[PDB]
Amino acid sequence: MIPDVSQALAWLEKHPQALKGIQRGLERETLRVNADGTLATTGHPEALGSALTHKWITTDFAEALLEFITPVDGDIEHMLTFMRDLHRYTARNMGDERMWPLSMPSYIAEGQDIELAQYGTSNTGRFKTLYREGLKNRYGALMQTISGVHYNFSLPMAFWQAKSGADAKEKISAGYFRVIRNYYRFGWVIPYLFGASPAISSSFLTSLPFEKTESGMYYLPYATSLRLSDLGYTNKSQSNLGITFNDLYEYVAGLKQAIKTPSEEYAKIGIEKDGKRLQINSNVLQIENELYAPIRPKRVTRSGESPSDALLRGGIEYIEVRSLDINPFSPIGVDEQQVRFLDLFMVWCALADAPEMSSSELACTRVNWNRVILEGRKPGLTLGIGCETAQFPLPQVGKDLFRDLKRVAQTLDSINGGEAYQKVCDELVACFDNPDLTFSARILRSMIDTGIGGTGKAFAEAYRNLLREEPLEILREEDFVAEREASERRQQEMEAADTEPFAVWLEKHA
Amino acid sequence: MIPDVSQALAWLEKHPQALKGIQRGLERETLRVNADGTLATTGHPEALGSALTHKWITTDFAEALLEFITPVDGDIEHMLTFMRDLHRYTARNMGDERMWPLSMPSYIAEGQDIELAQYGTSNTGRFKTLYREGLKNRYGALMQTISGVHYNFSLPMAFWQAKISGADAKEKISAGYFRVIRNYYRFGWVIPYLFGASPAISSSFLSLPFEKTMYYLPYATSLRLSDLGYTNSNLGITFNDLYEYVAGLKQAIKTPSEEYAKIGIEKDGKRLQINSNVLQIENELYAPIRPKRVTRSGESPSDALLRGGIEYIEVRSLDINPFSPIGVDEQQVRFLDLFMVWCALADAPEMSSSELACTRVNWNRVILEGRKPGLTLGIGCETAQFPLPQVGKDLFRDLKRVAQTLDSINGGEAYQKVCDELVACFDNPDLTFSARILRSMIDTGIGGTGKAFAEAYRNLLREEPLEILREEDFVAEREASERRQQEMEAADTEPFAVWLEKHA
Amino acid sequence: MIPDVSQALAWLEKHPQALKGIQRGLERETLRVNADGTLATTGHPEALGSALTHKWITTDFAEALLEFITPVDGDIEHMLTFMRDLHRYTARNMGDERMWPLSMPSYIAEGQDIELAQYGTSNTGRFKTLYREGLKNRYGALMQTISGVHYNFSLPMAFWQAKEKISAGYFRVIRNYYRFGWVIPYLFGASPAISSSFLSLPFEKTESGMYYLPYATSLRLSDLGYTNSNLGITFNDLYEYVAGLKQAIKTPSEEYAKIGIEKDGKRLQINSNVLQIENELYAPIRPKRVTRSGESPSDALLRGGIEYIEVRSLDINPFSPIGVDEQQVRFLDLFMVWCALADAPEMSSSELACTRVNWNRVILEGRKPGLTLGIGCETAQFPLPQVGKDLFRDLKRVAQTLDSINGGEAYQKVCDELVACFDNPDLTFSARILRSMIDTGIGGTGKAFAEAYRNLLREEPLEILREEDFVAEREASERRQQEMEAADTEPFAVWLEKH
Amino acid sequence: MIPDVSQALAWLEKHPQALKGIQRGLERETLRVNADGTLATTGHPEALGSALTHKWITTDFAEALLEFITPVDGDIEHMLTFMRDLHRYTARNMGDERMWPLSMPSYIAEGQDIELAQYGTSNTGRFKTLYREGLKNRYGALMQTISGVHYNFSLPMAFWQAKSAKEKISAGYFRVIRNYYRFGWVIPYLFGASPAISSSFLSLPFEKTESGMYYLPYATSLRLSDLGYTNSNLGITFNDLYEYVAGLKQAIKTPSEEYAKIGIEKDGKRLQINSNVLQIENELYAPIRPKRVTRSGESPSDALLRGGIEYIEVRSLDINPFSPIGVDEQQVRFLDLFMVWCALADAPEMSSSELACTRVNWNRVILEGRKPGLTLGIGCETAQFPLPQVGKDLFRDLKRVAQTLDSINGGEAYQKVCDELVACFDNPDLTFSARILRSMIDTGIGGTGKAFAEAYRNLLREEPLEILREEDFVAEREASERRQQEMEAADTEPFAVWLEKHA
Ligand SMILES: Nc1ncnc2c1ncn2[C@@H]1O[C@H](COP(=O)(O)OP(=O)(O)O)[C@@H](O)[C@H]1O
Ligand SMILES: [Mg+2]
Ligand SMILES: [Mg+2]
Ligand SMILES: [Mg+2]
Ligand SMILES: [Mg+2]
Numbered sequence A: 001m002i003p004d005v006s007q008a009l010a011w012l013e014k015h016p017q018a019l020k021g022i023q024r025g026l027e028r029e030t031l032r033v034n035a036d037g038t039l040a041t042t043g044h045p046e047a048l049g050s051a052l053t054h055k056w057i058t059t060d061f062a063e064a065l066l067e068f069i070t071p072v073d074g075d076i077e078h079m080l081t082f083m084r085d086l087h088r089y090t091a092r093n094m095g096d097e098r099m100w101p102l103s104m105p106s107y108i109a110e111g112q113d114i115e116l117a118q119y120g121t122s123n124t125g126r127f128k129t130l131y132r133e134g135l136k137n138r139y140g141a142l143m144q145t146i147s148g149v150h151y152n153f154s155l156p157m158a159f160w161q162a163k164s165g166a167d168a169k170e171k172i173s174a175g176y177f178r179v180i181r182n183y184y185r186f187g188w189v190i191p192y193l194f195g196a197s198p199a200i201s202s203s204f205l206t207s208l209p210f211e212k213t214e215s216g217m218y219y220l221p222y223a224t225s226l227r228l229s230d231l232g233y234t235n236k237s238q239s240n241l242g243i244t245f246n247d248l249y250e251y252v253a254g255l256k257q258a259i260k261t262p263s264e265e266y267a268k269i270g271i272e273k274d275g276k277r278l279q280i281n282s283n284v285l286q287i288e289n290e291l292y293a294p295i296r297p298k299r300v301t302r303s304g305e306s307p308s309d310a311l312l313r314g315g316i317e318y319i320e321v322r323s324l325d326i327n328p329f330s331p332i333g334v335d336e337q338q339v340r341f342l343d344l345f346m347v348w349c350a351l352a353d354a355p356e357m358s359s360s361e362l363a364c365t366r367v368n369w370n371r372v373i374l375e376g377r378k379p380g381l382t383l384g385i386g387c388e389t390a391q392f393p394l395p396q397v398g399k400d401l402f403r404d405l406k407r408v409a410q411t412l413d414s415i416n417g418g419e420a421y422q423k424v425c426d427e428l429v430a431c432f433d434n435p436d437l438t439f440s441a442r443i444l445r446s447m448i449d450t451g452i453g454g455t456g457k458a459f460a461e462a463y464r465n466l467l468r469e470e471p472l473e474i475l476r477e478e479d480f481v482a483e484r485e486a487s488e489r490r491q492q493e494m495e496a497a498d499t500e501p502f503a504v505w506l507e508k509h510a
Numbered sequence B: 001m002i003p004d005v006s007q008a009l010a011w012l013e014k015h016p017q018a019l020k021g022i023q024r025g026l027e028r029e030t031l032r033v034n035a036d037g038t039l040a041t042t043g044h045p046e047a048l049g050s051a052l053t054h055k056w057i058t059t060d061f062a063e064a065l066l067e068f069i070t071p072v073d074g075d076i077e078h079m080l081t082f083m084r085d086l087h088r089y090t091a092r093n094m095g096d097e098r099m100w101p102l103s104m105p106s107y108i109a110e111g112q113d114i115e116l117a118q119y120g121t122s123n124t125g126r127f128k129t130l131y132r133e134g135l136k137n138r139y140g141a142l143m144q145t146i147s148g149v150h151y152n153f154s155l156p157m158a159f160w161q162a163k164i165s166g167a168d169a170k171e172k173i174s175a176g177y178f179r180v181i182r183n184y185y186r187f188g189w190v191i192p193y194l195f196g197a198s199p200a201i202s203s204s205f206l207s208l209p210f211e212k213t214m215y216y217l218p219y220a221t222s223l224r225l226s227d228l229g230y231t232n233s234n235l236g237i238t239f240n241d242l243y244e245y246v247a248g249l250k251q252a253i254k255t256p257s258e259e260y261a262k263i264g265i266e267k268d269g270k271r272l273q274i275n276s277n278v279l280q281i282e283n284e285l286y287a288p289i290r291p292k293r294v295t296r297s298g299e300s301p302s303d304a305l306l307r308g309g310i311e312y313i314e315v316r317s318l319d320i321n322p323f324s325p326i327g328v329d330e331q332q333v334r335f336l337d338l339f340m341v342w343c344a345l346a347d348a349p350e351m352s353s354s355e356l357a358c359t360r361v362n363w364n365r366v367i368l369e370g371r372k373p374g375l376t377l378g379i380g381c382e383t384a385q386f387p388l389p390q391v392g393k394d395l396f397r398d399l400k401r402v403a404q405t406l407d408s409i410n411g412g413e414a415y416q417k418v419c420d421e422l423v424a425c426f427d428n429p430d431l432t433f434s435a436r437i438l439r440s441m442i443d444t445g446i447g448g449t450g451k452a453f454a455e456a457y458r459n460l461l462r463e464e465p466l467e468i469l470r471e472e473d474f475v476a477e478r479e480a481s482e483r484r485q486q487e488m489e490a491a492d493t494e495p496f497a498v499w500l501e502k503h504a
Numbered sequence C: 001m002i003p004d005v006s007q008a009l010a011w012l013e014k015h016p017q018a019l020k021g022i023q024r025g026l027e028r029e030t031l032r033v034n035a036d037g038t039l040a041t042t043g044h045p046e047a048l049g050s051a052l053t054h055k056w057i058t059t060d061f062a063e064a065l066l067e068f069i070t071p072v073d074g075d076i077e078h079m080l081t082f083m084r085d086l087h088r089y090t091a092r093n094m095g096d097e098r099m100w101p102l103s104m105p106s107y108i109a110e111g112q113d114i115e116l117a118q119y120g121t122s123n124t125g126r127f128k129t130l131y132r133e134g135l136k137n138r139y140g141a142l143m144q145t146i147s148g149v150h151y152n153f154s155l156p157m158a159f160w161q162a163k164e165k166i167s168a169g170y171f172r173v174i175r176n177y178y179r180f181g182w183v184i185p186y187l188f189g190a191s192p193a194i195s196s197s198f199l200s201l202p203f204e205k206t207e208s209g210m211y212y213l214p215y216a217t218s219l220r221l222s223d224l225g226y227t228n229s230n231l232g233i234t235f236n237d238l239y240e241y242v243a244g245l246k247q248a249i250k251t252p253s254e255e256y257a258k259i260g261i262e263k264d265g266k267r268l269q270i271n272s273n274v275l276q277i278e279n280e281l282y283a284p285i286r287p288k289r290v291t292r293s294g295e296s297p298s299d300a301l302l303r304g305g306i307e308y309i310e311v312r313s314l315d316i317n318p319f320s321p322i323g324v325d326e327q328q329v330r331f332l333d334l335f336m337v338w339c340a341l342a343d344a345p346e347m348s349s350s351e352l353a354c355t356r357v358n359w360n361r362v363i364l365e366g367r368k369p370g371l372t373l374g375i376g377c378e379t380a381q382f383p384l385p386q387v388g389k390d391l392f393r394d395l396k397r398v399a400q401t402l403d404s405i406n407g408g409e410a411y412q413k414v415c416d417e418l419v420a421c422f423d424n425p426d427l428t429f430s431a432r433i434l435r436s437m438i439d440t441g442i443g444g445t446g447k448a449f450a451e452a453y454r455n456l457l458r459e460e461p462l463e464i465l466r467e468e469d470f471v472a473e474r475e476a477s478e479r480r481q482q483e484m485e486a487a488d489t490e491p492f493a494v495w496l497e498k499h
Numbered sequence D: 001m002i003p004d005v006s007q008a009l010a011w012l013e014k015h016p017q018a019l020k021g022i023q024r025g026l027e028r029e030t031l032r033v034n035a036d037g038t039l040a041t042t043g044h045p046e047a048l049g050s051a052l053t054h055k056w057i058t059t060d061f062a063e064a065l066l067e068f069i070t071p072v073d074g075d076i077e078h079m080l081t082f083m084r085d086l087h088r089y090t091a092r093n094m095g096d097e098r099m100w101p102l103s104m105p106s107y108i109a110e111g112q113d114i115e116l117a118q119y120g121t122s123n124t125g126r127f128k129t130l131y132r133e134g135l136k137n138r139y140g141a142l143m144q145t146i147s148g149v150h151y152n153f154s155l156p157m158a159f160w161q162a163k164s165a166k167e168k169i170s171a172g173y174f175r176v177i178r179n180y181y182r183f184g185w186v187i188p189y190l191f192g193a194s195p196a197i198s199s200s201f202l203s204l205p206f207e208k209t210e211s212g213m214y215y216l217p218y219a220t221s222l223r224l225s226d227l228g229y230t231n232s233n234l235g236i237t238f239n240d241l242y243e244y245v246a247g248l249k250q251a252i253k254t255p256s257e258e259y260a261k262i263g264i265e266k267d268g269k270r271l272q273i274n275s276n277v278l279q280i281e282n283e284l285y286a287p288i289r290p291k292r293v294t295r296s297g298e299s300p301s302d303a304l305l306r307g308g309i310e311y312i313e314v315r316s317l318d319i320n321p322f323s324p325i326g327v328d329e330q331q332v333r334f335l336d337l338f339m340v341w342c343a344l345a346d347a348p349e350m351s352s353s354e355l356a357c358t359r360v361n362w363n364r365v366i367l368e369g370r371k372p373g374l375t376l377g378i379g380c381e382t383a384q385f386p387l388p389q390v391g392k393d394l395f396r397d398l399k400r401v402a403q404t405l406d407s408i409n410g411g412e413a414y415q416k417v418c419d420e421l422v423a424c425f426d427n428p429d430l431t432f433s434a435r436i437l438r439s440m441i442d443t444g445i446g447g448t449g450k451a452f453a454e455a456y457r458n459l460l461r462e463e464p465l466e467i468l469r470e471e472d473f474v475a476e477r478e479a480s481e482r483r484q485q486e487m488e489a490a491d492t493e494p495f496a497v498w499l500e501k502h503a
């Protein structure tokens, strides 16, 4: 089932310097909670300054939902250390609150009570909140509290150079679409290794054969990542809207068409209700982020550009992988082993040939993802090519892919010096013979002993105590203070610069 | 530019009995006004009973907007007399109020608080009012006070037999009516030419090279059909095939409109409209002509077409005839019979929705400047080169043959007379309704002209005795109509907002 | 989710004559009701002769359940006209009674006294009635008065020439029909509502007292309808299938042994096995061969292989006086040919069971915006609209091949019309009949249609069959029954064993 | 509204090879600016030699307005690469200056003293500079700094040979021009990239940002508006070669009350060439222009009379802000499709006021082309056709021309382009102008210009040459300076007297 990539591997083995200079960035989300596991209802902590403008620390959907963002970086340890400093500083400046360490929250009784991220009174800040109001009304606040890690990745120019004019940005875009098509066909290996959400609170809910406990914890005995299942998110699958990844313009046209298509469903919600604005507009997507997407091509926008404008202007700059659950075994929710595996997998995805796929061939790649998501750890599980009958045992497919990943590891290890990528392959490949080594088996044992609540409360306490004692390593305290002051100032400035009232301004971005 | 219809007229001539028993019905709308021409703000005249259920008299958009409807019927004189009985009775039972005799209203500024039509508390009743709230909020109440005449028409089975057992019937009849419709779009501009009666509008309604005083265009026929009138394109709806038509129409009631969502579904707890889709219901699709089948109880217009095929055709493009106390007359009706039949005979290739947009070019010429000397028309979008009068005459040689045939089965010369009268309008546009009514409006204004005719027509009608309906028949119907409303208002279990949910 | 068929299609496109000579037949059932909508209690109308032996008109489960059957035939218009002559004649010869136009009845209470179909006094007659007694006692009479339409279909010899190979090819058809045939109730299901008499699921009730699911298509096919599996019948091999079938005839049932076989001399079933006879295996589609004298269906199959297939999924089309129309028949032609072209991997017993999951989704909520289908038991993934369009890309190609041997564009017109239903489930039979039932009720709607179709059908002249053909067939059928009745037949118990 | 072109398309699908060997050339203009966006006041960069005689690089109106010209070519990739080589070389040889990347400039004041292109002391040079002095005095220098791309196009002989000469070809290109007037507004719809205008250029419902930028919310190309690069009072028509040329030659002799008030001389300095409606024929500004390469100091109109229309010059392209060279393959292929379509569709002859009527749709698209529910009309008649439906009707035909070209070229590039561009008719937000407007509302014309100019300079300075070697630029620098020298030495009469001989 794994295709044959000997030509591309051989090519890579003869050009190791083509991989020198990979760039990465991490985003990690986590709810602020009290010791009892419930969402804090305090505001974004003072010491973090303005969530709207801050460089490293912001909020996602909810006021209690923190997001840490590392600046693009070529060194894995440097980037993880940076991430850990954000966590350390935050952990000691949020009063008695702490950070929820799983993707799935514990029982929440009233989704409707959750405060949306608040961004002040400037037009940009309100738009951002109104966007969330919109999401709240379309899909419910509850699902937005489920969190994850994004891993952002780009190959160096050297890679493309070893593989002229206006073609360059086109070859690069084509190669990233290749990576994306391959992620669709094979990326189920990610939730298999690192899925960490085999259980969900009944407060968040089916034909599924759930085991139940009296506190409302539901779980599937072999699942890997319910975060990625239909129960773990509410919005429209890019796959489902019929967006494809064969060609850049086509992709952008599909995306932009969704921004402009009105929706009968969302019009029923209404745009206003008692002088309170309820969504930005009533289109399928309010803005491009509303598209649910396990993986997404990107380019950093310039001032005023929409994300898709940037793509059209400059082609794909880098890939965002969104399918990683929070790593509950790391205080920062992600570790070196995961980052190195994604390096190897993404690189492999860029090498393997990937035929174009129509909407329904893409839909078929999801059959395997669903098997792995809901019962990836089942003894005897078999996978198939697209929709064809399942017939390849999962472990053997894993070992096949790792035969290749190991060759890429050898190449990366020889340029970085050391053995770090090879060790990672050996550690991970073992998970195909023993599914009990995977994150989701480990975290299910924990959740059976103490619940989602008990497991999250206990890690959150333990992690709070590491994080708040550890010395800052790269950022120092005065950097947090400086960035607090500067972020607050940029917010005062946007507030003062507005000249039109929100209603008028809105009528030109709605 | 008129197609060759020889083969079919010859067929018709050998089959005169095939046209025996054409069925017709008319609807005619008119605003209740005061002596001074302002809109009456009183309610639907007590004597008429329940607008909601009455068999012959109701309202349209506005509480003050009367509409008279005749039951389907095979006899022209009978139908016209019935319509007149309705007017007679009504004029005698509305105090000092009288009926505006023009299409275009006059004493109404933009956003005048025009009372929507009222139908009691029933769910069906409250839904109809809400539809109108929607229409008001989407288009303005003002445009909804422009009034017209609809002519409803069906060929007799004998016609289709003379050209089919079981399931075939339904298909052939439908196919013939879509032909009628396509031909109407190609050639129906002849209607506003002859009978358009709104070459002027009051300022309230207002690009075009107007003249002021009251706005008008010197050669205009029917502004009620222009963009400033009873009009409301981008829909892709075609007339080739029953299934395609219904699919397109059903698609439109399910299509959300951004513009309309921005009105809201309800503001401050007052429900502003049934929904925010392009059409709230299928009635909102304004069109010059429309295929129809009588709906079962609560069944939708498009369901009925899909179940039974096209039953009859509704021609919607007639302005009020200002020269008749009942707003329509025998000359118009007979011309429509002739033109509809011709539409059923002539070959009419299928049209894509952009070919249909091209047929509107001639309509637009005729609408805004149909009486211009030298005016020429084209085939669709192709360059104009056919002088209008020669096209009319050409059409009328065919209508003449159809008229001979109809006259030979009835007995008499009545249809031939109509051909001879109307064909003269092509040589002299000054004989057409719009030339004549424009002279009158340039001189006394839309206002003056309307009040005068209103007043004359009222006096005439007040004295005329009833002929088919007896006073007793209106009284029984008042009672039975009010009875049916109560019998509905009571039979409602669940409250409006929930019933709406299931039907919105 | 649709398999790739483009190779088989290309072959078909190079061999259009391989489809010339498709044969079809229809069966359509309907309750005889009074104008008030209650079930008639009179006997089979006498102008129709012997239900037991008549060639075209008979009864199904109940004495008031008419069934109309067309003789196998190559021409669509002709088959539908014949069906219509049967309706016309009957409508003008059943007194003030009329034909219920919907699959689901109302005005019939649970455990009401439904007279079983009566076939006179011969071995065969008594046997047919006894089998019904058996069904009544096993599953209840009520379920048996749900009516439907069966479409019977066979490919010409020409097709295969481009006999054990004929059977394997019809099994391919069945396998594909299980995996994908939910498209039929989606387009044509017409029983979204159900009388209370038939009562888990999120039903709505009307003040009127009517139950319904907002997005349902065909409750007739649901578990509350004409239904039921751990029998393990498979459709991979002719003999494999026939064996499974015959074992099912011989397998005793704990539950039915409980009913008794005799209680006070009245025999209560044919036997106490899971299936009394082969007909009892209810299924959406069924392999078939016309049976000889005293032969059983399986014997028939064993002798000559599958001759044709019977598609049993169609609800009564509420919008046609004869309960089925040309658009349906044309669609099934396309669908059944496609089923014969697509590769269908063999399927085990429980793989076949998994195909029900999609059926149930479409049945219970097929019109739900955003509905997704899966493959077998697996997680729903594929949006219903895209799946349908994919199938119609292929059917459109089949349609071109059929139009070009027949002349015209009739098959392609059907593709265009119906694909439109995937963009708007409000065009489907079930959205339409539901709107109407929500205003007036099952009863209301049924009575209104039944009355209009009565008046309509009584005024239409006969076209293929003359009144005198019905009289002859009445008399011949009456005579055929008398001759069987007067035969010196074997003792019943022995006779039974001999079946 | 779109004519039916079935017979011509059926004809084409039968004679595919009728289109093999289309010829194209591009002109692209750009201002030389500093990192701060202000107009560079240095001279024509030295590495480029003589703007007057150089073969590929020259100036337009202003000394700071660069212009790149590709030599006529049959290969699209080759042509684009060649244009790019010119840019690369220039970008490396202009100090810290860069190329302004938008049609509309931002940091240029009204009445700003812009240095006119300088061509030296030869009579020809001084004439060219004087022409500009004329334009400056007649319309202001500001307008002349708005820049554009020209797409030059000819069908191969194989095309005319199959369609049934010299007079047939001219009638064909006139049919192209009449079609272009009727339907060419499709160009600024797709590729207009100037929906905002700086206040320097200032009855229309303009919006204005706190920063001081004016714009129309649905506009496409204000470069084509009255406020842009425009001068039509002349009633020149496109029915017949001799009528066209007569109209044009007459225009050059017709005096103008307005220009006479300016004067021919003032305090010893000559102000214009004459005080006629057009000083010379180039002054006639239009969206499209019929052309022949002029041989032997012949005038453009002379060339046309001598040899008929050789090619078409489509002048209505704005600078593509999303391409370092101001134009991309997608635009070129679309213009191939649309010009070929314009040669195939029937085009009745048009009076000068029928021509004026075609301008009504143009203005609509120019000023509010992206407005939801905009409708177009035929000529001056009631607006009745929703633009999306019209555009899609057109693309049904372009798509068949596209199949033809792809079958003779191999591949699917032309069909891909139809699929891309047809999407703009369902979604105006894909068009160049919506994309550039979002960026301008936010950082203004200045901010957006500077930012793009900065990135393209970095990009181009790094790219190696691909078709021209550095030797070639050096070789042409020397050869162009020589020719100028020669022309300067070879002059006999002082310019004042030479000028009377070419009044
Ligand atoms: N088969 C038919 N042929 C001709 N006219 C008909 C037929 N059926 C109904 N009509 C007429 O059509 C008209 C319908 O009027 P109305 O109830 O006002 O409907 P709407 O307002 O929807 O057009 C009535 O005048 C009726 O007489
Ligand atoms: Mg283990
Ligand atoms: Mg009305
Ligand atoms: Mg039966
Ligand atoms: Mg059967």
Ligand SMILES: [Mg+2]
Pocket: D027, D150, D313
């Ligand atoms: Mg030029």
